[PDB]
């Protein structure tokens, strides 16, 4: 099953519920759509990619690549991760 995470600018990101539960903050907001008034789509898209990456590479032996973050999104992405606790 999937959940919808909606950015401040209206982008609707549909991701697997278990991936989204990577964030306890998101867990609280569900307990199946969540709006983020402070997280724009260029940040929330990256957050979703992080979920996929975390779930793919957690408990795996195959070599782990760097999670890439452009300098231009790092500050907002930092603020988002701190809010989402992930």
């Amino acid at each position: 099953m999937y959940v919808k995470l909606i950015s401040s600018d209206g982008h609707e990101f549909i991701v697997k519920r278990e991936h989204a539960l990577t964030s306890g903050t998101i867990k609280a907001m569900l307990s199946n759509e969540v709006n983020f008034r402070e997280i724009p789509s260029h940040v929330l898209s990256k957050v979703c990619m992080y979920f996929t990456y975390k779930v793919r590479y957690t408990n795996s032996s195959t070599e782990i690549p760097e999670f890439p973050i452009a300098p231009e999104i790092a500050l907002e992405l930092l603020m988002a991760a701190n809010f989402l606790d992930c």
Partner: protein, 141 residues
């Protein structure tokens, strides 16, 4: 507590850096002091002489970010079974998104400018509280 035991029983090891980071190997000596050893560029290996019961950990040489070795924090050379060296596979952990963001922000902002960033005081503190072996030795203890 966290110290190498003086076994005197040799153990040959391959430090194998399967990370994109320059790696600082750190040996915990008999008094528990971290002793740094020469670095390993990304994707390179070294054959080295250590001993059973000796304790090692591995860090990004530039930033001291935590690395894993055979999927754990610490590496202890074991008995060489039929002459073969023990492989110590050094890898990136799956960092939290927060910690990865802090890495990137640290790598772009001089520490004297952390305070100039528009963020909650707690994140300034998080940036300032950068990775450090001494803190990790306290946490593991």
């Amino acid at each position: 507590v966290l110290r190498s035991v003086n076994s005197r029983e040799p153990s040959q090891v391959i430090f194998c850096n399967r990370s994109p980071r320059v790696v600082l190997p750190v040996w915990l000596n008999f008094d528990g002091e971290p002793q740094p050893y020469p670095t390993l560029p990304p994707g390179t290996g070294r054959r080295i002489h250590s001993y059973r019961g000796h304790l090692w950990l591995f860090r990004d040489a530039g930033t001291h970010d935590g690395l894993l070795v055979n999927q754990t924090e610490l590496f202890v050379p074991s008995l060489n079974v039929d002459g073969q060296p023990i492989f110590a596979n050094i890898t990136l952990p799956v960092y939290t998104l927060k910690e990865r963001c802090l890495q990137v922000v640290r790598s772009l902002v001089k520490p004297e400018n952390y305070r100039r960033l528009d963020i909650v005081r707690s994140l300034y503190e998080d940036l300032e509280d950068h990775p450090n072996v001494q803190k990790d030795l306290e946490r593991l203890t």
